Motif scaffolding. Structure first.
Motif, PDB file in Angstrom:
ATOM      1  N   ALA A  28      40.322  52.708  42.500  1.00 47.32           N
ATOM      2  CA  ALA A  28      41.785  52.877  42.467  1.00 47.32           C
ATOM      3  C   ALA A  28      42.331  52.709  41.056  1.00 47.32           C
ATOM      4  CB  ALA A  28      42.463  51.919  43.418  1.00 47.32           C
ATOM      5  N   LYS A  29      43.446  53.378  40.748  1.00 40.64           N
ATOM      6  CA  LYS A  29      44.089  53.205  39.445  1.00 40.64           C
ATOM      7  C   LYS A  29      45.378  52.404  39.579  1.00 40.64           C
ATOM      8  CE  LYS A  29      42.248  57.520  37.438  1.00 40.64           C
ATOM      9  NZ  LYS A  29      42.701  58.834  36.872  1.00 40.64           N
ATOM     10  N   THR A  30      45.915  52.358  40.791  1.00 45.29           N
ATOM     11  CA  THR A  30      47.222  51.720  41.004  1.00 45.29           C
ATOM     12  C   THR A  30      47.151  50.892  42.281  1.00 45.29           C
ATOM     13  OG1 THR A  30      48.127  53.658  42.150  1.00 45.29           O
ATOM     14  CG2 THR A  30      48.390  53.647  39.827  1.00 45.29           C
ATOM     15  N   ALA A  31      48.088  49.949  42.442  1.00 47.84           N
ATOM     16  CA  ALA A  31      48.191  49.177  43.647  1.00 47.84           C
ATOM     17  C   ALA A  31      49.671  48.916  43.896  1.00 47.84           C
ATOM     18  CB  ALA A  31      47.471  47.846  43.518  1.00 47.84           C
ATOM     19  N   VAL A  32      50.001  48.572  45.124  1.00 56.71           N
ATOM     20  CA  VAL A  32      51.359  48.042  45.410  1.00 56.71           C
ATOM     21  C   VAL A  32      51.183  46.605  45.868  1.00 56.71           C
ATOM     22  CG1 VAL A  32      53.453  48.237  46.766  1.00 56.71           C
ATOM     23  CG2 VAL A  32      52.190  50.309  46.057  1.00 56.71           C
ATOM     24  N   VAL A  33      51.762  45.677  45.110  1.00 56.80           N
ATOM     25  CA  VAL A  33      51.681  44.256  45.427  1.00 56.80           C
ATOM     26  C   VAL A  33      53.020  43.786  45.916  1.00 56.80           C
ATOM     27  CG1 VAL A  33      49.812  43.706  43.774  1.00 56.80           C
ATOM     28  CG2 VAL A  33      52.245  43.574  43.011  1.00 56.80           C
ATOM     29  N   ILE A  34      53.018  42.663  46.648  1.00 62.15           N
ATOM     30  CA  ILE A  34      54.257  42.076  47.073  1.00 62.15           C
ATOM     31  C   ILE A  34      54.398  40.779  46.287  1.00 62.15           C
ATOM     32  CG2 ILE A  34      55.632  41.123  49.013  1.00 62.15           C
ATOM     33  CD1 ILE A  34      53.863  42.941  50.864  1.00 62.15           C
ATOM     34  N   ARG A  35      55.415  40.753  45.425  1.00 65.94           N
ATOM     35  CA  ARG A  35      55.698  39.598  44.563  1.00 65.94           C
ATOM     36  C   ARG A  35      57.207  39.327  44.613  1.00 65.94           C
ATOM     37  NH1 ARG A  35      52.315  41.070  39.211  1.00 65.94           N
ATOM     38  NH2 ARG A  35      50.178  40.764  39.987  1.00 65.94           N
ATOM     39  N   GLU A  38      58.117  44.795  47.064  1.00 60.13           N
ATOM     40  CA  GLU A  38      56.994  45.665  46.640  1.00 60.13           C
ATOM     41  C   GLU A  38      57.125  46.064  45.175  1.00 60.13           C
ATOM     42  OE1 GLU A  38      56.488  47.373  51.194  1.00 60.13           O
ATOM     43  OE2 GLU A  38      57.067  48.758  49.587  1.00 60.13           O
ATOM     44  N   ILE A  39      56.022  46.003  44.430  1.00 60.04           N
ATOM     45  CA  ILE A  39      56.005  46.479  43.054  1.00 60.04           C
ATOM     46  C   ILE A  39      54.748  47.301  42.866  1.00 60.04           C
ATOM     47  CG2 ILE A  39      56.055  45.864  40.575  1.00 60.04           C
ATOM     48  CD1 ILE A  39      56.875  42.921  41.522  1.00 60.04           C
ATOM     49  N   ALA A  40      54.904  48.537  42.414  1.00 60.04           N
ATOM     50  CA  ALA A  40      53.725  49.366  41.994  1.00 60.04           C
ATOM     51  C   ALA A  40      53.229  49.019  40.592  1.00 60.04           C
ATOM     52  CB  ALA A  40      54.022  50.876  42.123  1.00 60.04           C
ATOM     53  N   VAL A  41      51.948  48.658  40.491  1.00 58.36           N
ATOM     54  CA  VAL A  41      51.389  48.203  39.219  1.00 58.36           C
ATOM     55  C   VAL A  41      50.068  48.913  38.929  1.00 58.36           C
ATOM     56  CG1 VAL A  41      52.375  45.857  39.360  1.00 58.36           C
ATOM     57  CG2 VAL A  41      50.114  46.266  40.379  1.00 58.36           C
ATOM     58  N   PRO A  42      49.692  49.026  37.639  1.00 61.76           N
ATOM     59  CA  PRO A  42      48.323  49.465  37.377  1.00 61.76           C
ATOM     60  C   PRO A  42      47.362  48.466  38.013  1.00 61.76           C
ATOM     61  CG  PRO A  42      49.357  48.680  35.358  1.00 61.76           C
ATOM     62  CD  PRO A  42      50.436  48.717  36.405  1.00 61.76           C
ATOM     63  N   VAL A  43      46.223  48.955  38.493  1.00 60.82           N
ATOM     64  CA  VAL A  43      45.321  48.093  39.275  1.00 60.82           C
ATOM     65  C   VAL A  43      44.857  46.870  38.466  1.00 60.82           C
ATOM     66  CG1 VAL A  43      43.255  49.439  38.757  1.00 60.82           C
ATOM     67  CG2 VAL A  43      43.331  48.102  40.895  1.00 60.82           C
ATOM     68  N   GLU A  44      44.788  46.987  37.147  1.00 57.57           N
ATOM     69  CA  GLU A  44      44.344  45.882  36.275  1.00 57.57           C
ATOM     70  C   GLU A  44      45.270  44.657  36.351  1.00 57.57           C
ATOM     71  OE1 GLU A  44      44.833  49.094  35.162  1.00 57.57           O
ATOM     72  OE2 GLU A  44      42.706  49.722  35.102  1.00 57.57           O
ATOM     73  N   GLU A  45      46.503  44.876  36.819  1.00 57.09           N
ATOM     74  CA  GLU A  45      47.491  43.804  36.922  1.00 57.09           C
ATOM     75  C   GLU A  45      47.377  43.032  38.228  1.00 57.09           C
ATOM     76  OE1 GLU A  45      51.503  45.009  35.936  1.00 57.09           O
ATOM     77  OE2 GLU A  45      50.804  46.031  34.134  1.00 57.09           O
ATOM     78  N   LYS A  77      43.970  54.569  49.271  1.00 53.52           N
ATOM     79  CA  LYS A  77      42.819  53.815  48.807  1.00 53.52           C
ATOM     80  C   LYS A  77      43.107  52.299  48.771  1.00 53.52           C
ATOM     81  CE  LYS A  77      40.670  56.162  45.943  1.00 53.52           C
ATOM     82  NZ  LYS A  77      40.216  56.964  44.771  1.00 53.52           N
ATOM     83  N   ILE A  78      42.194  51.506  49.338  1.00 61.03           N
ATOM     84  CA  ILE A  78      42.260  50.035  49.185  1.00 61.03           C
ATOM     85  C   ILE A  78      41.879  49.698  47.733  1.00 61.03           C
ATOM     86  CG2 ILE A  78      41.255  47.793  49.888  1.00 61.03           C
ATOM     87  CD1 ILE A  78      40.983  49.113  52.768  1.00 61.03           C
ATOM     88  N   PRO A  79      42.789  49.057  46.994  1.00 58.82           N
ATOM     89  CA  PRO A  79      42.526  48.974  45.531  1.00 58.82           C
ATOM     90  C   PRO A  79      41.583  47.900  45.032  1.00 58.82           C
ATOM     91  CG  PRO A  79      44.631  48.028  46.008  1.00 58.82           C
ATOM     92  CD  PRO A  79      44.133  48.556  47.326  1.00 58.82           C
ATOM     93  N   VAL A  80      41.448  46.808  45.788  1.00 63.04           N
ATOM     94  CA  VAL A  80      40.614  45.664  45.379  1.00 63.04           C
ATOM     95  C   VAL A  80      39.909  45.141  46.625  1.00 63.04           C
ATOM     96  CG1 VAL A  80      42.025  44.997  43.330  1.00 63.04           C
ATOM     97  CG2 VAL A  80      42.536  43.993  45.703  1.00 63.04           C
ATOM     98  N   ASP A  81      38.900  44.276  46.461  1.00 62.82           N
ATOM     99  CA  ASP A  81      38.319  43.581  47.641  1.00 62.82           C
ATOM    100  C   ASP A  81      39.256  42.483  48.125  1.00 62.82           C
ATOM    101  OD1 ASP A  81      36.115  45.121  46.854  1.00 62.82           O
ATOM    102  OD2 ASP A  81      34.791  43.399  46.572  1.00 62.82           O
ATOM    103  N   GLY A  82      39.304  42.289  49.432  1.00 66.58           N
ATOM    104  CA  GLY A  82      40.135  41.221  49.994  1.00 66.58           C
ATOM    105  C   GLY A  82      39.981  40.978  51.473  1.00 66.58           C
ATOM    106  N   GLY A 121      38.764  43.632  39.396  1.00 68.67           N
ATOM    107  CA  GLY A 121      38.118  43.994  38.133  1.00 68.67           C
ATOM    108  C   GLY A 121      36.613  44.094  38.329  1.00 68.67           C
ATOM    109  N   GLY A 122      35.865  43.439  37.448  1.00 63.84           N
ATOM    110  CA  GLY A 122      34.395  43.507  37.474  1.00 63.84           C
ATOM    111  C   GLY A 122      33.731  42.763  38.624  1.00 63.84           C
ATOM    112  N   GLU A 123      34.521  42.110  39.467  1.00 66.49           N
ATOM    113  CA  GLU A 123      33.968  41.351  40.574  1.00 66.49           C
ATOM    114  C   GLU A 123      33.942  42.054  41.924  1.00 66.49           C
ATOM    115  OE1 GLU A 123      34.852  36.799  38.912  1.00 66.49           O
ATOM    116  OE2 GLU A 123      35.537  37.425  40.921  1.00 66.49           O
ATOM    117  N   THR A 124      34.561  43.238  42.005  1.00 63.90           N
ATOM    118  CA  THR A 124      34.594  43.990  43.258  1.00 63.90           C
ATOM    119  C   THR A 124      33.153  44.425  43.634  1.00 63.90           C
ATOM    120  OG1 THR A 124      34.987  46.152  42.159  1.00 63.90           O
ATOM    121  CG2 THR A 124      36.952  44.913  42.867  1.00 63.90           C
TER     122      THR A 124
END
Length: 113
Positions: free
Chosen positions: A11-18, A22-29, A43-48, A96-99
């Motif tokens: 994934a390149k982007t995610a939507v987080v709830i902060r 809802e906020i759309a952020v680059p996945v690195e954030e 797409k599921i952007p990270v493991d969880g 990041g590198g842990e997925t």
């Protein structure tokens, strides 16, 4: 193909709830602990771990299994997999590198490096 295709699948982007919104952020954030919202078809952007919702998820791009897998509260989900049927809220556990995807890439890069 293979590993190169996998890197392209991240994934390149995610939507987080902060702060209650809802906020759309680059996945690195995205941070461990973040609540991510994933709509059907996204797409599921990270493991969880699923914290809200129930949906069939397509994991074929990692596991090779053509039949999607039911994900409900408490189930683990993986970055790069595709959410199919219902909105999920997921607490990020690895980014990041842990997925899982990143670990596969690293395994191959290290061995062939």
């Amino acid at each position: 193909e293979a590993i190169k295709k996998l890197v392209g699948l991240q994934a390149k982007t995610a939507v987080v709830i902060r702060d209650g919104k809802e906020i759309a952020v680059p996945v690195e954030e995205v941070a461990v602990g973040d609540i991510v919202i994933v709509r059907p078809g996204e797409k599921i952007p990270v493991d969880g771990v699923v914290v809200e919702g129930e949906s069939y998820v397509d994991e074929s791009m990692i596991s090779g299994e053509p039949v999607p897998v039911l994900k409900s509260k408490g189930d683990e989900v993986f970055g790069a997999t595709i959410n199919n049927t219902g909105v999920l809220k997921i607490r990020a556990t690895r980014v990041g590198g842990e997925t899982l995807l990143a670990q596969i890439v690293k395994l191959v890069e290290d061995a062939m490096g």
